[model samples]
Target: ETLVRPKPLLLKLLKSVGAQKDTYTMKEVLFYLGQYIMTKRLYDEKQQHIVYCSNDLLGDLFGVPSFSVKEHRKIYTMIYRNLVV
Candidate 1:
């Protein structure tokens, strides 16, 4: 089995945001996970395919929620800066 690591930008973003406490809901985690999944560009097409497939499966199972792509992009860019410098 192979491990897929997140981009440095993504890691920085995740670290900045931090994990929510016990009070936080699963929905929150799932939402962020979805965002992260969408942003990744996989070197392995198979990995990308699996991630997209999983996204579809989970989206259908859990029901898709409204997301703000602009907001996600903003945060992603901020994290990207951390990686560049």
Candidate 2:
């Protein structure tokens, strides 16, 4: 059965690495939906500085992997070579 996730949700959370283990899956792009929550996370550039919030993919699932400004910087650098947006 497919569980429907409402509101830019994150249903899948998996290890994202080049054949590595336990690493969360990341992709060519990341997406954020909201901010100011209970105390949790999730952006980008070259078009417009996007505030990355929540998203992800399971071994083959789905979700919106959001984060904080601090995490954004780290993830951004990891992806865009030390560039922030």
Candidate 3:
């Protein structure tokens, strides 16, 4: 099924976001996270590329309270921490 397993922390976040499945494709994880960001209006008012962390789950994931687009991309690479090998 080309499924990817999430680390416990990511899985917790996923469940919080209403993900019913225990396994997900990378695209689905990204989509769900992006949707959460959009629905919460987490983007900065002055800088469109900046996102403010609305909750502890997000802050813990990115290892910061907020991040810019470039940093977010960097985190995409680092997000391996949230995935099973």
Candidate 4:
């Protein structure tokens, strides 16, 4: 049931995240991205709503340095659109 597969950037991200599988559903991909942000301490300390993408891989894929919670919704959609659907 491989509904989605990673593009090159997403593949790099999945490998770094230690994903055992190469393919994931869109829901799974979004879940992992959320986990990654929390696990990697990408959120701003003072502003809990802000998520920063200082990691080179994240920056490249996100195409920005940081974003707010509101923007994250749109960002996730943007990312999923780029992945092999």
Candidate 5:
């Protein structure tokens, strides 16, 4: 499952002006991540109208263990599909 790909040019150009992965902590990333979702309007109908990312999302996004899905595959898939979707 190990793979490397260049990030989108726009993404690289934009993030160069903000925090790099090497420069931010998970806690700090949480703030920016939430801000990202809200700004992008990427959260779906259920997330906007009902539940949202406060659960296991941070686990995947921040590389922490999620109590809800502590097992490897499901949590990994959660993050994997997150980016794919």
Candidate 6:
């Protein structure tokens, strides 16, 4: 399993919301979305970086097949378009 590293924005948001980077906890995801909404700074670069990193991490952690870059991008774009509304 590949180690998961949060994107810069995710890391910053997590820290801002009092999440510990070294540990995985339920609060981290809540804090992540909370900051994303509060900050309104969801730049595409950070979003894409995070999506790819997360997909990779999930695959590695769960022994699922890793997505190719194109597949990852497609899923990211789709989620962004649908969920950002």
Tens-place lDDT digits, model 3, residues 1-85: 3678888888887777678878899888887777766776788777878888847577777677787767766768646777897
Model 1, C-alpha of 40: deviation from truth (Å): 1.2
The global C-alpha lDDT for each of the candidates, from Candidate 1 onward, is 0.39, 0.29, 0.76, 0.76, 0.40, 0.42
Estimate, for each residue in 24-84, the C-alpha lDDT of model 2 and write its tens digit: 2233123221222212321344322434444332101222353344556554443433112
Report the alpha-carbon TM-score of model 3 versus the true structure: 0.75
Better of 1 and 3 by lDDT: 3
Q: Count the backbone clashes (under 3 Å) in each candidate.
A: 0, 19, 0, 0, 0, 0
Error of 6 at 79 (Å): 9.5
If the candidates were sorted by their TM-score against the true structure, best first, what order would they fall in? 4, 3, 5, 6, 1, 2
Model 4 — which ten-residue stretch has the worst lDDT? Answer: 54-63
Candidate 6, position 62, lDDT:
22
lDDT of 4 by residue, 1-85 (tens): 4478879878777667767768788777877777778778888889978988856567678777888878868787768756876
Q: Pick the candidate with the highest TM-score.
A: 4
As for model 1, its CA RMSD to the true structure in angstroms is 13.7
Local lDDT at 38 for model 3:
71
| Sequence-dependent TM-score of model 1 | 0.28
TM-score of candidate 6 to 2 decimals: 0.28
- The parts of candidate 4 lying over 4 Å away from their true place are none
RMSD of each: 13.7, 14.1, 2.4, 2.3, 9.9, 12.2
Residue 12 lDDT in model 3? 80
Which residue runs of candidate 5 sit more than 4 Å off their true CA positions? 1-22, 49-85
